[PDB]
Amino acid sequence: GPNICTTRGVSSCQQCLAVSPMCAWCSDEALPLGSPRCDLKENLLKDNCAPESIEFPVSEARVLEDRPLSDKGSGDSSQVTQVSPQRIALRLRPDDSKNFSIQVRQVEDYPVDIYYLMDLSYSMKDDLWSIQNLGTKLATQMRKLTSNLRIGFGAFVDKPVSPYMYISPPEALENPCYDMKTTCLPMFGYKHVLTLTDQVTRFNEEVKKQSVSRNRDAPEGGFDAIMQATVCDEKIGWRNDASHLLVFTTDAKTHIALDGRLAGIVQPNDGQCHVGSDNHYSASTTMDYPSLGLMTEKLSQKNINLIFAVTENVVNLYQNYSELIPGTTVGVLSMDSSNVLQLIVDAYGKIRSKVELEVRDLPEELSLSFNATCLNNEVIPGLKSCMGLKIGDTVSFSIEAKVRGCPQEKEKSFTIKPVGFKDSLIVQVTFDCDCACQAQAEPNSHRCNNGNGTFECGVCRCGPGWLGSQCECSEEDYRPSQQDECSPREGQPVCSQRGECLCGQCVCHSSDFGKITGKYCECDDFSCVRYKGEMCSGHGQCSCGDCLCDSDWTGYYCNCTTRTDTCMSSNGLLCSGRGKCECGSCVCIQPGSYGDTCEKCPTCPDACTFKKECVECKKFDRGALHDENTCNRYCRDEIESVKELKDTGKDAVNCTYKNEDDCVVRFQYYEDSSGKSILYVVEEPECPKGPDILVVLLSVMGAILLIGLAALLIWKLL
Amino acid sequence: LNLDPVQLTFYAGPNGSQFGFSLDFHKDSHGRVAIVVGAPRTLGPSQEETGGVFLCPWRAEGGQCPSLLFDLRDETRNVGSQTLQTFKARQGLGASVVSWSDVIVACAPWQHWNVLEKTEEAEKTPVGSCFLAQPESGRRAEYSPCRGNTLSRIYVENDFSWDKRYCEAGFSSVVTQAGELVLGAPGGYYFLGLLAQAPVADIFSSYRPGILLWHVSSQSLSFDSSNPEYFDGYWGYSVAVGEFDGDLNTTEYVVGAPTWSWTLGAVEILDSYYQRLHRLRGEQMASYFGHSVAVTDVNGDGRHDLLVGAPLYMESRADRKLAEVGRVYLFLQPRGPHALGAPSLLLTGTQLYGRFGSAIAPLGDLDRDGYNDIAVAAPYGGPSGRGQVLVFLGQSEGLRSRPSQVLDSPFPTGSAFGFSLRGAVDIDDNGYPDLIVGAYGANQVAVYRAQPVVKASVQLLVQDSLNPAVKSCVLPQTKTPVSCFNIQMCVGATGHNIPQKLSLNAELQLDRQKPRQGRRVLLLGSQQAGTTLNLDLGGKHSPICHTTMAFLRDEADFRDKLSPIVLSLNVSLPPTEAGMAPAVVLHGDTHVQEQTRIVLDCGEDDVCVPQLQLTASVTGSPLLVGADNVLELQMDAANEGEGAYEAELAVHLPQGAHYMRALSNVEGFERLICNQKKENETRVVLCELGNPMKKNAQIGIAMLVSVGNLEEAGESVSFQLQIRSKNSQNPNSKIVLLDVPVRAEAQVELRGNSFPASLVVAASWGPKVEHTYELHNNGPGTVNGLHLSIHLPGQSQPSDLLYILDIQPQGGLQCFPQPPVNPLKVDWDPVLVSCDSAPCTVVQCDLQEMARGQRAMVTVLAFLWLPSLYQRPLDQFVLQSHAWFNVSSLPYAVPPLSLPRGEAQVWTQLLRALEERAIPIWWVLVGVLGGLLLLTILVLAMWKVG
Numbered sequence A: 001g002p003n004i005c006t007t008r009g010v011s012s013c014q015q016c017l018a019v020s021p022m023c024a025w026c027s028d029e030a031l032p033l034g035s036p037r038c039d040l041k042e043n044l045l046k047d048n049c050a051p052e053s054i055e056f057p058v059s060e061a062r063v064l065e066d067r068p069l070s071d072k073g074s075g076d077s078s079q080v081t082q083v084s085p086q087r088i089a090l091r092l093r094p095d096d097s098k099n100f101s102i103q104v105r106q107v108e109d110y111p112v113d114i115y116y117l118m119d120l121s122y123s124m125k126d127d128l129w130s131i132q133n134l135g136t137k138l139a140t141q142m143r144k145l146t147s148n149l150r151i152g153f154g155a156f157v158d159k160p161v162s163p164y165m166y167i168s169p170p171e172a173l174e175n176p177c178y179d180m181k182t183t184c185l186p187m188f189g190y191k192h193v194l195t196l197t198d199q200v201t202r203f204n205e206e207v208k209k210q211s212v213s214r215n216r217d218a219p220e221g222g223f224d225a226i227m228q229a230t231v232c233d234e235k236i237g238w239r240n241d242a243s244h245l246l247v248f249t250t251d252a253k254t255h256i257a258l259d260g261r262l263a264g265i266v267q268p269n270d271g272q273c274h275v276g277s278d279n280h281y282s283a284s285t286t287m288d289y290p291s292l293g294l295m296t297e298k299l300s301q302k303n304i305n306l307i308f309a310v311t312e313n314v315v316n317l318y319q320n321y322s323e324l325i326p327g328t329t330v331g332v333l334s335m336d337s338s339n340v341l342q343l344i345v346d347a348y349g350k351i352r353s354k355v356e357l358e359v360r361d362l363p364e365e366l367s368l369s370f371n372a373t374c375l376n377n378e379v380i381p382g383l384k385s386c387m388g389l390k391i392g393d394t395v396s397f398s399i400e401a402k403v404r405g406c407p408q409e410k411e412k413s414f415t416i417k418p419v420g421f422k423d424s425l426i427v428q429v430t431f432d433c434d435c436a437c438q439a440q441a442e443p444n445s446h447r448c449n450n451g452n453g454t455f456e457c458g459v460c461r462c463g464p465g466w467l468g469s470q471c472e473c474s475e476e477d478y479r480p481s482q483q484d485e486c487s488p489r490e491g492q493p494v495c496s497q498r499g500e501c502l503c504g505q506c507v508c509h510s511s512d513f514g515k516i517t518g519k520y521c522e523c524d525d526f527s528c529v530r531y532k533g534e535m536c537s538g539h540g541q542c543s544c545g546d547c548l549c550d551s552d553w554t555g556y557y558c559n560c561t562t563r564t565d566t567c568m569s570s571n572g573l574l575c576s577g578r579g580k581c582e583c584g585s586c587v588c589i590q591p592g593s594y595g596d597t598c599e600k601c602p603t604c605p606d607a608c609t610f611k612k613e614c615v616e617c618k619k620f621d622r623g624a625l626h627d628e629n630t631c632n633r634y635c636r637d638e639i640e641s642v643k644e645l646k647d648t649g650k651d652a653v654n655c656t657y658k659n660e661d662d663c664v665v666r667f668q669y670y671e672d673s674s675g676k677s678i679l680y681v682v683e684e685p686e687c688p689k690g691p692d693i694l695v696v697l698l699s700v701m702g703a704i705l706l707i708g709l710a711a712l713l714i715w716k717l718l
Numbered sequence B: 001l002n003l004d005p006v007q008l009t010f011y012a013g014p015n016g017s018q019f020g021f022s023l024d025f026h027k028d029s030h031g032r033v034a035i036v037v038g039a040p041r042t043l044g045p046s047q048e049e050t051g052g053v054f055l056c057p058w059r060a061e062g063g064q065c066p067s068l069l070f071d072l073r074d075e076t077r078n079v080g081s082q083t084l085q086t087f088k089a090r091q092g093l094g095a096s097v098v099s100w101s102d103v104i105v106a107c108a109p110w111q112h113w114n115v116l117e118k119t120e121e122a123e124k125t126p127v128g129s130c131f132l133a134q135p136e137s138g139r140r141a142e143y144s145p146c147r148g149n150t151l152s153r154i155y156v157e158n159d160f161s162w163d164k165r166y167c168e169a170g171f172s173s174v175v176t177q178a179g180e181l182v183l184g185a186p187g188g189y190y191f192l193g194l195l196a197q198a199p200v201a202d203i204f205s206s207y208r209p210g211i212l213l214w215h216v217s218s219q220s221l222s223f224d225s226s227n228p229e230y231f232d233g234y235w236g237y238s239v240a241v242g243e244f245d246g247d248l249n250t251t252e253y254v255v256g257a258p259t260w261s262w263t264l265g266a267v268e269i270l271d272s273y274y275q276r277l278h279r280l281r282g283e284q285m286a287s288y289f290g291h292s293v294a295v296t297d298v299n300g301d302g303r304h305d306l307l308v309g310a311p312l313y314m315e316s317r318a319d320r321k322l323a324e325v326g327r328v329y330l331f332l333q334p335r336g337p338h339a340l341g342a343p344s345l346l347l348t349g350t351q352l353y354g355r356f357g358s359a360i361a362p363l364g365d366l367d368r369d370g371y372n373d374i375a376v377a378a379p380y381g382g383p384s385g386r387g388q389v390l391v392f393l394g395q396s397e398g399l400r401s402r403p404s405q406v407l408d409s410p411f412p413t414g415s416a417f418g419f420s421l422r423g424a425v426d427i428d429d430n431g432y433p434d435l436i437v438g439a440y441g442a443n444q445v446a447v448y449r450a451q452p453v454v455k456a457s458v459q460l461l462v463q464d465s466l467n468p469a470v471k472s473c474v475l476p477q478t479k480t481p482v483s484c485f486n487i488q489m490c491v492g493a494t495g496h497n498i499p500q501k502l503s504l505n506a507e508l509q510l511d512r513q514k515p516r517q518g519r520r521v522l523l524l525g526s527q528q529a530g531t532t533l534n535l536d537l538g539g540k541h542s543p544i545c546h547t548t549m550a551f552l553r554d555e556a557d558f559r560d561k562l563s564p565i566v567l568s569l570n571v572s573l574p575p576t577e578a579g580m581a582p583a584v585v586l587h588g589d590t591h592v593q594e595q596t597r598i599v600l601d602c603g604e605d606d607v608c609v610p611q612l613q614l615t616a617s618v619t620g621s622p623l624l625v626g627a628d629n630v631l632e633l634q635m636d637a638a639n640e641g642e643g644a645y646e647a648e649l650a651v652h653l654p655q656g657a658h659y660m661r662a663l664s665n666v667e668g669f670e671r672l673i674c675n676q677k678k679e680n681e682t683r684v685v686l687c688e689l690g691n692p693m694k695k696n697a698q699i700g701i702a703m704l705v706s707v708g709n710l711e712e713a714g715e716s717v718s719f720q721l722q723i724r725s726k727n728s729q730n731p732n733s734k735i736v737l738l739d740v741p742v743r744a745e746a747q748v749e750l751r752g753n754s755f756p757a758s759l760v761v762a763a764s765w766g767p768k769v770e771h772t773y774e775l776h777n778n779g780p781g782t783v784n785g786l787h788l789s790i791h792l793p794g795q796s797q798p799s800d801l802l803y804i805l806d807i808q809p810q811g812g813l814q815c816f817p818q819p820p821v822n823p824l825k826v827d828w829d830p831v832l833v834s835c836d837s838a839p840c841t842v843v844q845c846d847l848q849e850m851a852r853g854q855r856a857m858v859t860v861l862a863f864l865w866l867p868s869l870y871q872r873p874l875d876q877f878v879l880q881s882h883a884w885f886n887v888s889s890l891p892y893a894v895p896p897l898s899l900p901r902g903e904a905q906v907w908t909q910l911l912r913a914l915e916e917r918a919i920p921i922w923w924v925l926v927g928v929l930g931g932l933l934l935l936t937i938l939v940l941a942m943w944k945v946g
């Protein structure tokens, strides 16, 4: 059929192939009356013309280098290769999209280095006493997960500048805590003391030699310390072949950018390291606090995971900050900082139980769409990150790349990287929108009307208007006018009142506001929807008046979004399983639910209502709907057999499950604020002893039989 | 828009002095305009940084400026047993400079104050100060509203109550028209922020040299707050003045607190007595919402509007989900005392880390268009990251998202170009306001001078149709008859203070589309298809009209007849002469196209007389207030007369309407094209019906119209439809009016639940059971007069099966029970029970206001009465609670239509560890008796038979 290659083309191989993703060109000479050289490959094959000269470029996704994913990382970590493939090359024809797949795995044991950054404000003094013997305990607890561990320490109070300091009296300069009769060190912004070393005893030795300072303003400038630790890789010694952890412990608010106006500092912050041989922040008094954007950028560049181990009084603020910075985890730190060890131990698993992907060096020319595959063959469309993973779990991500035209560079490259990992995929894209036959050139050929034109791939393009099939109609020539070759379905104005009927064809004109193309000058740009000063929503390019969407978008205006990252809840189900996600917004089908993810429902049935099936296998290894494999398919809660029955769980309440045995099974559901939902179930539930008639009736019939035997023996004697 | 980025004026100060940190205009008694620029880090006499102020006179070439003289020596005084000391080192004098009439107020926020008494002291803290100067009389004065003689021990014992030692007064300053200086102190009251208000005249007349500490009689300051939200709020970062209460006597203040509510930001509108009239909250954490505030009338309605900035705002990008670009919020003051709602307009930057919106400066009517404009500075924006200034023009609906003009930074990297802006003042006396932009990094101030704006109106007139048969003209120098027609071009220039001598080049091109050699109509005079003229409109208020003759070539020379003849007129400025520097900026209608055609198929009369008929219908008639109303208009147009020339469909929509999509049922390859534009105030949509459309053509168009929020359109809205045709006879069709009624309707949902749904009691205080009821206003509209009643069994007595401990309402609803519940303080087969049978306890809740999307919750706690649990424990117990609510009216003009109702019933069932109810052994006994009877009769059968 005509399709779209036959129309809107037939001018040259370049445009002919640049119309639709599926068009073919017949360079070999053939009958020119069959409208050839722009049609589906099948039509050309039916018309022959395939002597190894058929031109039909197709997209390719050849893998250059690929290595198997390692099982365990213990030695020679330079080739762990936890992300495969490592580097692939893509060749895309104009306006065509191609898909590939990648796999991400955590390689069991992996070296870990942890840098401990602790505030040293007066209120933190007691906390410093509870860390004097943390290195050995941390090493012992972490030995079960990592066989190569390094630890470090840091400090920070605030900018040494008024009004943050006590400038007067002079004695306060060397002893701010002089009113309360105590000894304290002068204020400092950031004081690195211990570099990342494998010697555990060094961490203990360095601690208990430190002190605590004092300041006036309640907020503490910890972002400066975080940025200095992140950027100054050599000073503290981050290791490129290990997982990075940065524990940030604080008990007060944190300053942000533009807060230095009070102290007179106005210079914007820069990420260049400013830690000298004295191990202090030289530019603390002359550099402003860093903004969240720069902090996140420099934290992602260096692949540093952040743990906000903060007190309960400011936990909400750091939770709100956490959802902005990717790869960050929050935690509650006790007043005496005695929960730091377990907090970091569990936060390690929490952070390693999350896989995301980020794109770097992505040119604006092309766009990417993502599908994720969590554990099992289940696939969540429009998602680049999977939750609810564990150590050694393997996940898959399908990435589709779509381009617009062919940029005049022919060499582009970008990278897809999981957060907090050195290994990443390097994707090289080369655009091929030029036909091979064009290399023949033949700028002057006698077939182009005695060498006054150009010949290309079987067609003569000649002069500034010479467009006849034989390169003879010229521009001012062809004065006599023919018919049935300038308008379709005669009865309408020629060239749609836009163009001139010359050489037997409608030459479109008025190259203003864009370009006009088409066998009848009907398709054109600058005739599409305008959302906000941008055509076709500014995402995709519109062809022939249709707002052709680009990747990540689908709609008439191409404003609706396909990726569902924003509409994913924390339970691993889209929109909390109580609604759908459309254009990046959750619509809650279930009544009585509202919120960003349809999660804040106050009037829904309690959890235990749908938890009956989950607890069936744990306590019985049987039950209805066992074919679906409901034992562990949707409920991640852990069931424990404990008869304590006296737990003081604030966010917990007892409930009951009914069994076919007619015995009520009372169990507790605790929804911890950390997300570790746990069920406490009493084993062998006490079924009341009902049946007591069998013995009675057996005794009655035995007595009746005895009476009958007595009668029988009386008869025998008689 | 009309600012000149080529001819600027540069003012320079001492190197490394941060010249240009703050700047302002100053007008003397003679009207002469000068610039006041503060350099916080100017070197003092003792080779130390103390700051300074420079009064630059207006010079075209700029250069160095003189510096105003202020005292820069430490003052030590002894009063009683106290010693008062002032330290001015690194005080940053000039960080905020303002001018009022003949007074220049330059503030040093970081000036330090201290008091010594034997051993104790008040500590050395940056109280700050402000120096007031009167150059004409050469007078000097000082003002420091945060100076005290209270020792630190008193503050410590009083929990730091009324602690003004860290005011940093002078961070932001503003002088009202009445003459009341207002200074912001973000660090006052221990980093809570405050304001200090004082008349300038009182300050001048209440100052005695040598008296460091004094009190002004008319001084007034803001009060302290204990709310944790205000903690570390820096309330006072930016201060502005304006009118918002509707009364001209009172002056309202706008105060920014970027770190309000845990790094969320806020902007508070208060009255003269520091009473919170309104608060505007932030949108994102750490966005520094409220860094800069500006008050101006962008829409021109006569009511001041609000502009807020958030330099640290982060947007979403494909490459990275967070990108610090900054944002600007525009809030428009509505009619009446209605509280400001969501931001009227949002403006977002492009460059990363650009800190867009850090400086917003009003410019007045820069282009003399009747609407005020503004300038927004991004200190580190642009591709090179050197800074930019975007000029936004005003309109009836507000501001335009697209920036009219963008000015780059001629200074090198690190100049912080755009940090300080100021305008709305005429310095060259050319009738237009100018702009001044500081750059402390390069220590230079750049002055941009506005240029006159010339509005051009161009009109082209030509005959609708041409008849080659009639020939009247004759070619020059020959005797060859030929047809001809007249083309008239009118060009008019308008403006204010436009140059007396003005020249404009007007180019006329006939049949532009066709090649030069193939043109059909040619000018009679020069026999050329194109012409150019130089019109001297200088001082010609009325438009200048010119006329020319154009003739059609012989029929043999060309064969095309159907293609329309298009004529284009293009008006432009003369080419750049010696010295460049264009005098004026030209904008408006500088290009006009008009199309004629040859007579064809118009009948023997040779004059086409189209007759157009139009019918319109509307679907989606119910219009709900506050909803995404999408009407569908179906229009059928027919031409029973002759072919219509350049026939289009005009659809005038109401104020809140918009155009989304349009389809044409007739034909599948027609490619219908419709456009939307605002002629004067209405959104007119023009759809192309056809150039010489064929006979008896019938076209149907179905278009979607999105009606926006409407609260004053009245009972019904009106849509107008007509057909526009260029034909001389019957140029337009009959006017069609569609009246769409508007009604307000809202649905309210009541949902009830019980926790736990299933409870089992084994065999004091028993198990806890709670009932929750939620009211949700899912309806697009708003409901008032909401009254709800919750009915529960029992009366909260020991005999009652269930005992109510406490009822918690949430959402502002006011609830009261009856009878009173929880008499004791208490420091801690199914059977149906309901209010209908058992004693009824009714709790009534009221809500006068219930906005769209709001939810109200009511929870009631109780526990099963164990003494009543023990008795008859073998009976299943199902309890029920009932609800009944309804509203009174709606806050909308349209009366319709009653509603809504609600009936919620909540059930809760209880169980026990198996019931001891009599097992149905009666059936077993009956079966045993029947079997015994059957056995007896069977035995007797053969017993009697034998």
Ligand SMILES: *[C@@H]1O[C@H](CO)[C@@H](O[C@@H]2O[C@H](CO)[C@@H](O[C@@H]3O[C@H](CO[C@@H]4O[C@H](CO)[C@@H](O)[C@H](O)[C@@H]4O)[C@@H](O)[C@H](O[C@@H]4O[C@H](CO)[C@@H](O)[C@H](O)[C@@H]4O)[C@@H]3O)[C@H](O)[C@H]2NC(C)=O)[C@H](O)[C@H]1NC(C)=O
Pocket (backbone or CB within 6 Å): A099, A370, A371, A381, A382, A398
């Ligand atoms: C990542 O996630 C996206 C989003 O879901 C996935 O996109 C989906 O891919 C599916 C498989 O390609 C699509 O399913 C079908 O695939 C058709 C193309 O394959 C044709 O198969 C027929 C079978 O007889 C062959 O003859 C043909 O020659 C093709 O090979 C799709 O075109 C089709 O989608 C429909 O197409 C019709 C006609 O074009 C449209 O009118 C209709 O609106 C719809 O688009 C069919 O669904 C699936 O549609 C598609 N999802 C979409 C388009 O929303 C990716 O596949 C995922 N990535 C990976 C690696 O799986």
Ligand SMILES: *[C@@H]1O[C@H](CO)[C@@H](O[C@@H]2O[C@H](CO)[C@@H](O[C@@H]3O[C@H](CO[C@@H]4O[C@H](CO)[C@@H](O)[C@H](O)[C@@H]4O)[C@@H](O)[C@H](O)[C@@H]3O)[C@H](O)[C@H]2NC(C)=O)[C@H](O)[C@H]1NC(C)=O
Pocket (backbone or CB within 6 Å): A449, A450, A451, A452, A463
């Ligand atoms: C390839 O294209 C070029 C233009 O890009 C063509 O150039 C011109 O082509 C036209 C074709 O109509 C020529 O006009 C034709 O010429 C004939 C022959 O006249 C000749 O005149 C020369 C002197 O100039 C004599 O020496 C010859 O002997 C011969 O008599 C004439 O009868 C007509 O005028 C006819 O239209 C035109 O001459 C030519 N340009 C030049 C400079 O010669 C070119 O022809 C074309 N190649 C082809 C057609 O093979």
Ligand SMILES: *[C@@H]1O[C@H](CO)[C@@H](O[C@@H]2O[C@H](CO)[C@@H](O[C@@H]3O[C@H](CO)[C@@H](O)[C@H](O)[C@@H]3O)[C@H](O)[C@H]2NC(C)=O)[C@H](O)[C@H]1NC(C)=O
Pocket (backbone or CB within 6 Å): A316, A317, A320, B262
């Ligand atoms: C940190 O995150 C929390 C949770 O997202 C945010 O707190 C929420 O802030 C919104 C502000 O719009 C509150 O909504 C408002 O609540 C008031 C009552 O306080 C109500 O009268 C208004 O009509 C509006 O609904 C919301 O309640 C609040 N929620 C919680 C749980 O605090 C906020 O971003 C941060 N809060 C911190 C740091 O405390």
Ligand SMILES: *[C@@H]1O[C@H](CO)[C@@H](O[C@@H]2O[C@H](CO)[C@@H](O[C@@H]3O[C@H](CO)[C@@H](O)[C@H](O)[C@@H]3O)[C@H](O)[C@H]2NC(C)=O)[C@H](O)[C@H]1NC(C)=O
Pocket (backbone or CB within 6 Å): B787, B885, B886, B887, B888
């Ligand atoms: C809607 O809400 C209003 C509250 O503003 C309710 O007003 C009440 O309406 C009743 C009419 O039925 C008034 O009369 C009452 O009737 C009952 C019997 O049903 C009787 O027992 C009372 O003594 C009284 O006479 C009642 O006075 C009125 N309430 C007040 C405070 O004036 C209205 O009933 C509600 N409508 C619906 C349909 O729910």
Ligand SMILES: *[C@@H]1O[C@H](CO)[C@@H](O[C@@H]2O[C@H](CO)[C@@H](O)[C@H](O)[C@H]2NC(C)=O)[C@H](O)[C@H]1NC(C)=O
Pocket (backbone or CB within 6 Å): A098, A099, A100
């Ligand atoms: C997405 O990628 C998969 C895997 O490369 C593609 O599936 C293969 O497609 C080729 C070509 O059609 C087939 O020969 C293979 O048999 C397919 N394998 C599997 C496992 O399906 C898939 O076609 C790609 N989808 C798109 C839209 O490009």
Ligand SMILES: CC(C)CCC[C@@H](C)[C@H]1CC[C@H]2[C@@H]3CC=C4C[C@@H](O)CC[C@]4(C)[C@H]3CC[C@]12C
Pocket (backbone or CB within 6 Å): none
């Ligand atoms: C007059 C005498 C001989 C009558 C005796 C009646 C006998 C046959 C009755 C008395 C009790 C009965 C049993 C009671 C309960 C059960 C359990 C049931 O799951 C299967 C049948 C079974 C096992 C019954 C079988 C029949 C039974 C043994």
Ligand SMILES: CC(C)CCC[C@@H](C)[C@H]1CC[C@H]2[C@@H]3CC=C4C[C@@H](O)CC[C@]4(C)[C@H]3CC[C@]12C
Pocket (backbone or CB within 6 Å): A711
């Ligand atoms: C321990 C208990 C059960 C013993 C009771 C003794 C019973 C079996 C005795 C008491 C009276 C007796 C009956 C007395 C008289 C007669 C009439 C005779 O023409 C036939 C036997 C007959 C009908 C006897 C049958 C047995 C009898 C019913």
Ligand SMILES: *[C@@H]1O[C@H](CO)[C@@H](O)[C@H](O)[C@H]1NC(C)=O
Pocket (backbone or CB within 6 Å): A531, A557, A559, A560, A583
């Ligand atoms: C694109 O435009 C609207 C208006 O901004 C936006 O709200 C929505 O996501 C898209 N439009 C529709 C109809 O979905």
Ligand SMILES: *[C@@H]1O[C@H](CO)[C@@H](O)[C@H](O)[C@H]1NC(C)=O
Pocket (backbone or CB within 6 Å): A645, A646, A647, A648, A649, A652, A653, A654, A668, A669, A670
């Ligand atoms: C269960 O009931 C007991 C009362 O015996 C109570 O203390 C506890 O908080 C309830 N919840 C859980 C999870 O145990």
Ligand SMILES: *[C@@H]1O[C@H](CO)[C@@H](O)[C@H](O)[C@H]1NC(C)=O
Pocket (backbone or CB within 6 Å): B015, B016
């Ligand atoms: C002094 O002024 C010059 C002017 O060019 C500038 O280059 C220099 O940085 C300034 N500072 C010093 C210390 O010279």
Ligand SMILES: *[C@@H]1O[C@H](CO)[C@@H](O)[C@H](O)[C@H]1NC(C)=O
Pocket (backbone or CB within 6 Å): B248, B249
């Ligand atoms: C203040 O109100 C009084 C009384 O209405 C009025 O006379 C006066 O003009 C007002 N002040 C103004 C408008 O400045």
Ligand SMILES: *[C@@H]1O[C@H](CO)[C@@H](O)[C@H](O)[C@H]1NC(C)=O
Pocket (backbone or CB within 6 Å): B570, B571, B572, B590, B591
């Ligand atoms: C027509 O006017 C526009 C400005 O309105 C100008 O840019 C263009 O150059 C003009 N056309 C010609 C041919 O000069």
Ligand SMILES: *[C@@H]1O[C@H](CO)[C@@H](O)[C@H](O)[C@H]1NC(C)=O
Pocket (backbone or CB within 6 Å): B679, B680, B681
């Ligand atoms: C637009 O409406 C205003 C109403 O004041 C009117 O003055 C103006 O003439 C109208 N515009 C046109 C083009 O008619």
Ligand SMILES: [Ca+2]
Pocket (backbone or CB within 6 Å): A123, A124, A125, A126, A127, A335, A336, A337
């Ligand atoms: Ca502590």
Ligand SMILES: [Ca+2]
Pocket (backbone or CB within 6 Å): A157, A158, A164, A215, A216, A217, A218, A219, A220, A221
């Ligand atoms: Ca601090």
Ligand SMILES: [Ca+2]
Pocket (backbone or CB within 6 Å): B243, B244, B245, B246, B247, B248, B249, B250, B251, B252
């Ligand atoms: Ca007022």
